């Protein structure tokens, strides 16, 4: 090696060695992630250094939780991380397609072919595949049923069947609740609060908010039926003067006077709140709830509780907007001019105590534009798994709503794309037909992996499905229970169009870049 | 005891003679060989593993050279000249390295033949002067008003990179960004793409969605949710001073002896904040961007006037916003003027991309700053795309400053070599031999192009030389992808004259610098 | 991890697809090394021993013995090639290449979920058919000096330089025809090969006697 | 040919210390073996005849007890499947309060039978589906097995009889006395309103007199001493202050600025006069007892002693809140005299010495109050800790009874009946899931088997007799531990009963843990780090 | 016993179970009782215990002698604890309690 | 992403202290350089001078 004569402590792989290393790493990653694909996938256990336990089958989570220190593995992990960040699904398919693309490319490269021709064929095949995907997508009106089908297709692959069935309703209802007509969906308005006291099937949707903190005063009411919500960001505790004030007195009476007079600033704001509460509700029938982002000292807590006001302090910053959209009031940074029109309304507010943790519920809102999903489970790892599943489901439903088109799943679209690529192959000049064939075979990995995970054999199931597609022309996928060809659209197995497009683009780009790498160097020391 | 007596300190090595020259030339040749294969449209990419754990998948010569560590000082000099070439003109970083390596390789021959390095240096300097003359002679003019020619130039600059697949979009982005950054004031032309042409990478999406904005884009959100996230025609006020209450410079201590002084002090703090926000509001703006924090009370007073506030923005981003929307950054709002109010932005939109909020001030009219929003597969791909776009923008600004063009693909090298040989035919002294040697050493670029293309080097070079021996064949290069000789008047591969001049100058001067050197001494401290 | 590692903690085990991958990787590495040996257009390899002795060769068996390999599958293939050399005296490089390509082609289908046993059955059937075809295609002829010269050329050209091969062809054919008895097995022990280090490589010849 | 290299791919990419286990015999069987080992470790402490275990943690702290949850939490469990089962047991303890040993035993039996089913040929998914179906069938069957209900909770004898069984497994020799104490303490709490709070029952452990001398106090006991000279009050008028019993000071900064000699000579005298005025103003309301959460100044203590005011200082604010609940007072934030509603009343406050420790007792006379305290005597700290655990079990059983009054027979009767019914259901269900259903039914036999093994008789004879009797039609017959030979008896008459909610939650959690362990197929363990605990645990 | 590549409890855990551990506990209690036997009665004798610092404690009191002993046996600490309990509740008989308990176990 | 593993095949099967050089730039040019170096060492003792 040339560089080794300059930096002796350098590790270098050149020419076919770099390709061999990259393809070996990709094949190892693909072998690990093969068992993840499909609802028939296998649970994986992830034990951290500290002993934490995770139970996931996500491609991104598994990639982040294996003990791998390989460069190509890092590149594929970053690609999958981008896929998860933007689309929220398809990481396992991403890794599988990258690995199969590299394997099919090597199958021709090892026989004297240059990788550049393979990359040209990959580009042509990707263009044709994108055209076919445009031609095959199903534009539909995203009613509740289609969103439920998409949520099933995600959650069944993520969690147990019954838990998936519950999470489908939860996710779809939450998304439909927070969605405004002709407006981008803000997933920040769906709070995901997790409790650890009941079974996993008790996860539900609350048309309001759940706060992980409660009132700090024992005498405050634990339950208010008709409540006026005051969302505020005003400090109600003692605040020191910024310019080093200090006090100077000459007697105990003067010290007492100064002590009584140093609370007047906060007392004025507390009195303003109390006067507003008295004006708004002259009886004990209605209630008043104060949710403050900043702290409240015990003196103000006692003063408010003397008037029967429930006060919550140190709320999360996002809860300001969440309460504004749910209850309907307005967050106040000061009490300069506050009017009964700045108060939100909640049809029921109560506090729930669990161990050493106290929770506050805000339900029965008029028309909540922000809702929460209450994750419940007997174990921490169950809660983490359900959180990952609901994140995937929310991403899938949001993607389905964003563009009215949805793509049939179960690998039918991959089979049709491969068949179209094979048909289009003669139109490609030069030796790029080999790259086109490799791209088609790589696309065919998804039905192969689905059939293998379901317990059937790859070749027989694949040839059956391909023959059915050629004979009928429909979009026939993989039946994970019988192995026979099956129409994905009829049964309701749907895939996100954006997810498929991102898979094609990212997989092709990263495979082309990796195939063109001819040297791996580590000489920064 | 009785430690040895020494003149120089310990661990002080010293080599001398032919060994030092041979070692320097071998180090330069090894540096050239490292990136020899990364030249031409058929160049392969390399993976670099950073000591911090990062991966740099790149085709650029300068990045590869700067990502490695070497101990031989000649290799350090080669890395330094690569960085110099990258900083001066933008591209040509591997061509200059290859040229310097070849020049030192051909100078070693004469060094071994009882020729003093000063003679070789004088011949090299004469050759460099004649190379400059010939390059200026064979150049062609270009009108910057023709957008098609500029796009073709940028394309020929980026055909050798990984962005050649989306070359058209890349060229349009680079040309638009360079054109809109171009600015003049007080009779001083300025094209500052380092500061006012920002490239932002957000992984995900497709590269076809990447575009240059008629404005700026920052990773910021409103300080308070009530503030509007969408304003059609906003009046922008820029600040670089806190909207909070802060202690003074002098050591100030209050002394409270009365009951009402504490509350009075707090109320005056609030009133000072209110007066500051009133001074803001007096100009009636729509959005307020500040480099320092904004207090919650200030946010309330601003929302009372229906004003969107952005809390903490970097200095460079604030300067970009000022250039784009025509604002002027101020510090004391009591001195705010109407001229400081930034009007010209056609839209302010804050939309969530992925899981993060981003602020768009796009749709500006006559913006002097831009943000190139890059979307792609991952971070490494986007980094390589950004490097290619930087190369394209540097080539565009070089063409804008210097409208001359010279043929590419080795045609310029062959033409200059032939002219140098013809001039040397009349030389009679001993200096002619190194003169011809460097003249033919200039032919390494077409040879490397042929080698990377995979064709036959010897017969293609011989045919190209025979073609260049004719009269009107100065533009005859070689395809980097089909391995055939073509006239570049037809292929269209042209490169800026400035890039070629800088490459030849740097290569020759590096050869001179490493030829002047003998008696390496090492080991001493500072 | 496994049963053996449970009984013997300091044990090395490769199970299921791991063993197949290890064997196929070793075979592919051996094939990658010995690809360049095949044919007269092959490339010389210089082999340096621990003591510093220099050996130039292109023989498959000689190269295999002098490779610095400590792999079990490599050892198995080396034993097979050694037997091939011992009995027939040729075809070691072809042996290694065919073994490696067989393993690679078998893995190409095994990675698709196919069981190795079916591949082995297909291998047996194909081997039977190939043996029948080889019996059909062979060219039976009485061998005069010309055919023996052609065979010796086809070997020595693939072994050494063309001119040296041309000299050695006449040498070896004349020696064999000299010691050959009619309708009797050829005793190669009766041809003495003696080394002298005083002339050029083309000065080697055959002495109708003994040295 | 002397070393076996690592297979290309994931095997080589694995880190130096990581471990990867994939496949049935490498992951599932190993996890089942680990869970079986954990169940074996805890099994011997099941039932009334269970034996205590001396467990020493990493801090040389003894834990002699037969509480399954306590043993598991004091054990350094490292296997992650055993960690799942331990978390399931802890969740059962948190939700109900008793049945952790049941959860662990049932999970272990289910996992061993799942291993057997996998060995005979069944797939993991089929076993999981069979266990889920059988668990649903058992949950359906369980309500039909309820034999009686609490039917009252304000009674003393009835509640004691109900709670006897729960605290019979622990402290088997003497449970009637503990049952009476816990019943009295819980009946004092749990007013006409249906809400019952477990935290309202306090336990004070004082060493010396043996557990037979334990008593129940309608009040609170603090192991402290009075600050002042008054040590006994008969008609206490407790005033509670969260502020320190001292003159208030500015929160910003205090600086006494003296500019004349008169101020210097008058400052201390005026401060003392102000202290005296404040103390006398507090006393003028009749408050003869003052409780503070902060420090006590010397001048304030002197003036309190002058006016015959009993001073008690409580450092913990939890104790202050509990005292406010017990007496009915309000924690004043300032040193102002308490208004008539904020001044709490207790029938007797005095300083006493129980055994060795000096205690302050806020004793009521009525058989009511918000908080009741159980004083536990004994000869060893560990013995009192075990008695406290038994008291916690009894209180949790009372809370469960308040939540649900339905009861099921104990002593293995319910488990045997459940096994019989699940086997009958599974004998009719076709398909491969019948094997899993039958194994789930058989897993219930581990409870009577463990009871018989701990009692010292032959488990097989007991199980056969139980099946015979339940086939005869007696659903309320289980193991009789008061015999030297395998024998059974009806325990609806014997009063050995278990809460319906406890059994329901235990079955649900054990099945969930078992199926969660079974679902796992691959193990990827990172290299164990020697870090000083995760930052979450502080 | 088998290696069990993933051990259940943390490495170094020591477990003793069955009749032998009960007999060992009884023997440990006998050992503890033997250390305070000669201090009982009008003809009793005092014991001298030296700590690490070098200070010496001379006492005829059973509770004091047991406390100064650095007993670490889990079963033997019960005798020390009941001696402390007898000292706290009554103040005398701190040797009789240990002798009686050990004799019961014996 | 901090170390380059050895390429599968012959590179992994190579012995501990063994070395392998293949190709022009790393075998033929190196051998030519070594021979030129030896000739350079012996050159100065050529001829009567
Ligand atoms: N019920 C089903 N029947 C058949 N195929 C399905 C079913 N559900 C999902 N699939 C297919 O299996 C794939 C599941 O992949 P998944 O595990 O979600 O990977 P990722 O999480 O990376 O998207 C989808 O591409 C979908 O087409
Ligand atoms: N299509 C082409 N055919 C032949 N030569 C080309 C072509 N495109 C670019 N080149 C040559 O390749 C060189 C650019 O290679 P590049 O990798 O950018 O090296 P550098 O970074 O030194 O410019 C230019 O000198 C140009 O003459
Ligand atoms: N007097 C008794 N006779 C027979 N069995 C009993 C008696 N008391 C309790 N049991 C049985 O002992 C079991 C309680 O075991 P226990 O040690 O309390 O475990 P856990 O604390 O996990 O509930 C109950 O299932 C009950 O059937
Ligand atoms: Mg998915
Ligand atoms: Mg360039
Ligand atoms: Mg041969
Ligand atoms: Mg119990
Ligand atoms: Mg005595």
């Amino acid at each position: 090696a040339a560089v080794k004569t300059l930096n002796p402590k350098a590790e270098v792989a050149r020419a076919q060695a770099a390709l061999a290393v990259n393809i070996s790493a990709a094949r190892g990653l693909q072998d690990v992630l093969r068992t993840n694909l499909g609802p028939k996938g296998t649970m994986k256990m992830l034990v951290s250094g500290a002993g934490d336990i995770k139970l996931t089958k996500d491609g991104n989570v598994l990639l982040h939780e294996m003990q791998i220190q390989h460069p190509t593995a890092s590149l594929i992990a970053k690609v999958a991380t981008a896929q998860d960040d933007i689309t929220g699904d398809g990481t396992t398919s991403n890794v599988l397609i990258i690995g199969e693309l590299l394997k099919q490319a090597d199958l021709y490269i090892s026989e004297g072919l240059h990788p550049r021709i393979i990359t040209e064929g990959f580009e042509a095949a990707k263009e044709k595949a994108l055209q076919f995907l445009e031609e095959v997508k199903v534009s539909r009106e995203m009613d509740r049923e289609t969103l439920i089908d998409v949520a099933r297709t995600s959650l069944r692959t993520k969690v147990h069947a019954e838990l998936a069935d519950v999470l489908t309703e939860a996710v779809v209802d939450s998304i439909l609740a927070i969605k405004k007509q002709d407006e981008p969906i803000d997933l920040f308005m769906i709070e995901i609060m997790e409790m650890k006291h009941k079974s996993e099937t008790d996860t539900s949707l609350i048309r309001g908010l759940v706060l992980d903190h409660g009132a700090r005063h024992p005498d405050m009411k634990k339950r208010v039926e008709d409540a006026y919500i005051l969302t505020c960001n005003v400090s109600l505790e003692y605040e020191k003067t910024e310019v080093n004030s200090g006090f100077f007195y000459k007697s105990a009476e003067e010290r007492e006077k100064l002590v009584k007079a140093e609370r007047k600033f906060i007392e004025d704001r507390v009195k303003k709140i109390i006067e507003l509460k008295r004006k708004v509700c002259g009886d004990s029938d209605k209630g008043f709830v104060v949710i403050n982002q900043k702290g409240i000292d015990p003196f103000s807590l006692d003063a408010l509780s003397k008037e029967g006001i429930v006060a919550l302090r140190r709320a999360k910053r996002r809860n300001m907007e969440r309460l504004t959209l749910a209850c309907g009031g307005v967050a106040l940074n000061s009490f300069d001019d506050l009017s009964p029109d700045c108060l939100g309304h909640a049809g029921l507010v109560y506090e729930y105590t669990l161990g050493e943790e106290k929770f506050t519920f805000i339900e029965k809102c008029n028309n909540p534009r922000s809702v929460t999903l209450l994750i419940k489970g007997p174990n921490k790892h169950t809660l983490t798994q359900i959180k990952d599943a609901v994140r995937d489901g929310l991403r899938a439903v949001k993607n389905a709503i964003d563009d009215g088109c949805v793509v049939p799943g179960a690998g039918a679209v991959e089979v049709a794309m491969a068949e179209a690529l094979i048909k289009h192959k003669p139109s490609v000049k030069g030796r790029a037909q080999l790259g086109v064939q490799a791209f088609a075979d790589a696309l065919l990995i998804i039905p192969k992996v689905l059939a293998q995970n379901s317990g059937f054999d790859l070749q027989e199931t694949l040839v059956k499905i391909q023959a059915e597609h050629s004979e009928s022309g429909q979009l026939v996928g993989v039946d994970l229970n019988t192995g026979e060809p099956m129409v994905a659209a009829e049964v309701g197995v749907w895939d996100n169009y954006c997810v498929k497009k991102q898979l094609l683009h990212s997989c092709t780009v990263i495979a082309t870049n990796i195939l063109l790498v001819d040297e791996i160097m580590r000489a920064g020391m | 005891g009785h430690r040895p007596v020494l003149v120089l300190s310990q661990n002080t090595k010293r080599e001398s003679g032919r060994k030092v020259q041979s070692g320097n030339i071998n180090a330069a040749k090894t540096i050239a060989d490292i990136i020899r294969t990364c030249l031409g449209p058929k160049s392969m990419m390399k993976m670099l593993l950073d000591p911090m754990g990062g991966i740099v998948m790149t085709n650029d010569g300068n990045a590869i050279l700067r990502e490695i560590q070497v101990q031989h000082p000649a290799a350090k000099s080669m890395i330094e000249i690569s960085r110099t070439q990258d900083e001066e003109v933008g591209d040509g970083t591997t061509s200059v390295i290859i040229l310097a390596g070849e020049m030192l390789s051909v100078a070693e021959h004469f060094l071994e033949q009882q020729m003093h390095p000063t003679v070789v240096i004088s011949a090299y300097r004469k050759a460099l002067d004649d190379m400059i003359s010939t390059l200026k002679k064979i150049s062609i003019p270009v009108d910057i008003s023709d957008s098609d020619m500029m796009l073709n130039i940028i394309n020929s600059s980026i055909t050798t990179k990984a962005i050649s697949r989306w070359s058209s979009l890349a060229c349009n982005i680079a040309l638009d960004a360079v054109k809109m950054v171009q600015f003049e004031e007080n009779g001083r032309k300025e094209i500052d793409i380092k500061k006012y042409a920002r490239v932002e990478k957000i992984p995900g999406g497709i590269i076809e969605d990447s575009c240059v904005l008629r404005g700026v884009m920052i990773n910021k959100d409103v300080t308070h949710p009530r503030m509007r996230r969408y304003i059609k025609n906003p009046r922008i006020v820029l600040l670089d001073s806190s909207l909070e209450y802060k202690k003074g410079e002098s050591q100030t201590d209050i002394e409270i002896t009365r009951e009402e002084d504490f509350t009075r002090i707090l109320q005056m703090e609030e009133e000072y904040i209110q007066q500051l926000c009133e001074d803001i509001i007096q100009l009636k703006p729509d959005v307020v961007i500040t480099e320092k924090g904004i207090s919650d009370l200030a946010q309330h007073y601003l929302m009372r006037a229906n004003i969107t506030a952005i809390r903490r923005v970097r200095k460079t981003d604030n300067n970009r916003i000022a250039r784009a929307c025509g604002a002027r950054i101020v510090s004391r709002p009591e001195e705010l003027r109407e001229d400081d109010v930034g009007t010209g932005a056609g839209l302010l939109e804050i939309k969530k991309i992925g899981d993060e909020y981003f602020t768009f001030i796009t749709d500006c009219k006559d913006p002097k700053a831009c943000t190139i929003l890059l979307r792609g597969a991952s971070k490494e791909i986007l980094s390589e795309v950004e490097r290619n776009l930087q190369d394209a923008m540097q080539v565009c600004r070089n063409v804008l400053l210097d409208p001359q063009l010279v043929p590419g693909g080795g045609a310029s090298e062959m033409a200059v070599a032939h002219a140098l040989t013809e001039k040397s035919k009349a030389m009679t002294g001993v200096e002619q031999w190194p003169y011809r040697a460097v003249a033919q050493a200039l032919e390494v670029i077409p040879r490397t192009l042929i080698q990377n293309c995979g064709a036959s080097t010897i017969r293609l070079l011989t045919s190209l030389r025979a073609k260049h021996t004719q009269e009107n064949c100065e533009t005859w290069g070689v395809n980097g992808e089909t391995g055939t000789l073509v006239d570049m008047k037809e292929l269209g591969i042209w490169e800026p004259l400035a890039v070629k001049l800088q490459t030849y100058k740097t290569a020759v001067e590096t050869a001179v610098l490493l030829l002047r050197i003998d008696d390496i001494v090492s080991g001493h401290k500072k | 991890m496994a049963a053996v590692k449970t009984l013997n903690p300091k044990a090395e085990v490769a199970r299921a697809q791991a063993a197949l991958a290890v064997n196929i990787s070793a075979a592919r590495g051996l094939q990658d090394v010995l690809r360049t040996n095949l044919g007269p257009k092959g490339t010389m390899k210089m082999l340096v021993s621990g003591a510093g002795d220099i050996k130039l060769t292109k023989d498959g068996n000689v190269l295999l013995h002098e490779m610095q390999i400590q792999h079990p599958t490599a050892s198995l293939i080396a034993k097979v090639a050694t037997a091939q050399d011992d009995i027939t005296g040729d075809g070691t490089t072809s042996n290694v290449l065919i073994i490696g390509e067989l393993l690679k082609q078998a893995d190409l289908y095994i990675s698709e979920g196919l069981h190795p046993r079916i591949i082995t059955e297909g291998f047996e059937a194909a081997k039977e058919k190939a043996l029948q075809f080889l019996e059909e295609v062979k060219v039976s002829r009485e061998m005069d000096r010309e055919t023996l010269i052609d065979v010796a050329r086809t070997s020595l050209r693939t072994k050494v330089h063309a001119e040296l091969a041309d000299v050695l062809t006449e040498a070896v054919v004349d020696s064999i025809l000299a010691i050959k008895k009619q309708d009797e097995p050829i005793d190669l022990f009766m041809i003495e090969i003696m080394e002298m280090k005083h002339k050029s490589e083309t000065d080697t010849s055959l002495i109708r006697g003994l040295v | 040919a002397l070393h076996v290299p690592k297979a290309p791919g994931f095997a080589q990419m694995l880190k130096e210390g990581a471990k990867h286990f994939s496949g049935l015999e490498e992951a599932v069987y190993r996890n089942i073996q680990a869970c079986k080992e954990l169940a074996q470790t805890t099994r011997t402490a099941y039932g009334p005849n269970g034996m205590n275990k001396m467990v020493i943690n990493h801090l040389e702290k003894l834990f002699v007890t037969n509480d399954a949850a306590t043993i598991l939490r004091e054990l350094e469990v490292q296997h992650p499947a055993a960690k799942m089962i331990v978390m399931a047991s802890h969740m059962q303890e948190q939700e109900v309060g008793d049945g952790t040993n049941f959860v662990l035993v049932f999970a272990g039996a289910l996992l061993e039978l799942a291993e057997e089913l996998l060995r005979i040929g069944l797939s993991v998914s089929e076993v999981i589906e069979g266990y889920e179906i059988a668990c649903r069938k058992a949950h359906e069957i369980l309500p039909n097995l309820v034999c009686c209900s609490a039917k009252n909770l304000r009674d003393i004898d009835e509640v004691s009889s109900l709670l006897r069984t729960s605290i019979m497994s622990k402290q088997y020799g003497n449970e009637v006395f503990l049952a009476k104490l816990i019943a009295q303490a819980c009946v004092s709490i749990f007013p006409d309103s249906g809400h019952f709070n477990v935290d309202n029952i306090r336990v004070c452990k004082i060493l010396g007199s043996g557990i037979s001398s334990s008593s129940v106090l309608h009040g609170m006991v603090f192991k402290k001493e009075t600050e002042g000279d008054v040590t006994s009050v008969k008609d206490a008028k407790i005033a509670v202050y969260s502020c320190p019993f001292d003159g208030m000071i500015t929160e910003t900064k205090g600086t006494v600025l003296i500019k004349t000699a008169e101020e210097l000579m008058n400052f201390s005298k005026g401060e003392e006069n102000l202290m005296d005025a404040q103390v006398k103003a507090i006393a003028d309301t009749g408050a003869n007892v003052v409780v503070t959460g902060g420090k006590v100044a010397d001048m304030a203590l002197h003036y309190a002693n002058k006016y015959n005011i009993m001073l008690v200082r409580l450092n913990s604010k939890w104790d202050l809140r509990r005292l406010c609940k017990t007496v009915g007072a309000t924690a004043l934030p300032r040193l102002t005299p308490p208004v008539l509603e904020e001044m709490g009343h207790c029938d007797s406050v005095y300083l006493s010495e129980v055994g060795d420790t000096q205690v302050v007792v806020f004793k009521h006379e009525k058989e009511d109050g918000a908080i009741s305290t159980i004083v536990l005597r004994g000869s060893t700290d560990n013995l009192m800790d075990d008695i406290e655990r038994a008291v916690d079990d009894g209180v949790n059983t009372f809370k469960v009874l308040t939540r649900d009054k339905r009861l099921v027979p104990g002593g293995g009767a319910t488990e045997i009946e459940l096994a019989k019914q699940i086997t009958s259901y599974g004998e009719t269900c076709p398909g491969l899931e019948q094997y899993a259903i039958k194994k789930f039914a058989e897993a219930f036999e581990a409870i009577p088997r463990a009871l018989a093994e701990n009692s010292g008789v032959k488990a097989n004879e007991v199980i056969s007799k139980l099946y015979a009797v339940h086939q005869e039609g007696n659903k309320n017959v289980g193991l009789d531990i008061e015999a030297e030979v395998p024998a059974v008896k009806d325990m609806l008459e014997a009063g050995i009963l278990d809460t319906y909610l406890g059994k329901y939650w235990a079955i649900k959690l054990a099945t969930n843990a078992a199926v969660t362990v079974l679902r796992v197929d691959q193990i990827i363990m990172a290299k164990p780090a020697g870090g000083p605990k995760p930052p979450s645990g502080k | 016993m088998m290696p069990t590549p993933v051990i259940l409890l943390k490495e170094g855990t020591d477990s003793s179970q069955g009749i032998p551990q009960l007999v060992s506990n009884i023997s440990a209690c006998q050992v503890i009782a033997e250390a305070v036997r000669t201090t009982l009665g009008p003809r009793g004798m005092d014991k001298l215990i030296v700590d690490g610092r070098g200070k010496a404690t001379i006492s005829n009191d059973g509770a004091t002698i047991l406390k100064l002993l650095d007993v670490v046996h889990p079963a033997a600490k019960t005798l020390v604890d009941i001696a402390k309990s007898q000292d706290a509740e009554v103040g005398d008989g701190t040797t009789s309690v240990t002798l009686l308990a050990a004799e019961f176990l014996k």
Side-chain angles (χ1 to χ4, degrees), chain A residues 79 83 94 98 501-511, chain B residues 205 376-377:
Chain A
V79 164
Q83 169 86 38
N94 214 315
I98 294 162
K501 194 202 295 207
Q502 191 81 49
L503 286 175
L504 282 161
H505 275 99
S506 291
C507 288
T508 309
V509 161
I510 189 70

Side-chain angles (χ1 to χ4, degrees), chain A residues 45 47 197 238 240 249 255, chain D residues 95 251-252 257 271 522 526:
Chain A
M45 213 180 187
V47 182
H197 69 115
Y238 168 81
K240 283 187 184 295
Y249 42 85
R255 180 175 70 213
Chain D
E95 176 73 29
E251 193 144 32
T252 313
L257 195 55
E271 175 172 33
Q522 297 192 30

Side-chain angles (χ1 to χ4, degrees), chain D residues 423-500:
Chain D
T423 308
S424 301
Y425 169 71
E427 281 171 0
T428 74
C429 182
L432 297 190
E433 59 191 0
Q434 66 182 333
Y435 302 95
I437 294 165
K438 283 164 178 158
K439 282 307 156 198
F440 187 96
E442 177 160 339
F444 277 109
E445 300 181 358
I447 306 305
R449 179 172 298 279
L451 287 172
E453 280 178 0
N454 286 345
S455 166
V457 303
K458 275 290 169 303
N460 304 307
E461 296 189 45
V462 172
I463 284 177
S464 56
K465 287 160 68 72
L466 280 178
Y467 285 166
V469 174
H470 281 243
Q471 281 299 138
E472 294 294 328
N474 309 131
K475 296 187 299 185
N476 288 330
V477 164
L479 178 56
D480 183 10
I481 62 169
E482 272 149 38
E484 310 94 311
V485 294
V488 302
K489 68 175 179 192
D490 196 312
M491 294 182 286
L492 189 55
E493 281 89 2
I496 295 149
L497 312 162
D498 300 336
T499 53
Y500 165 87

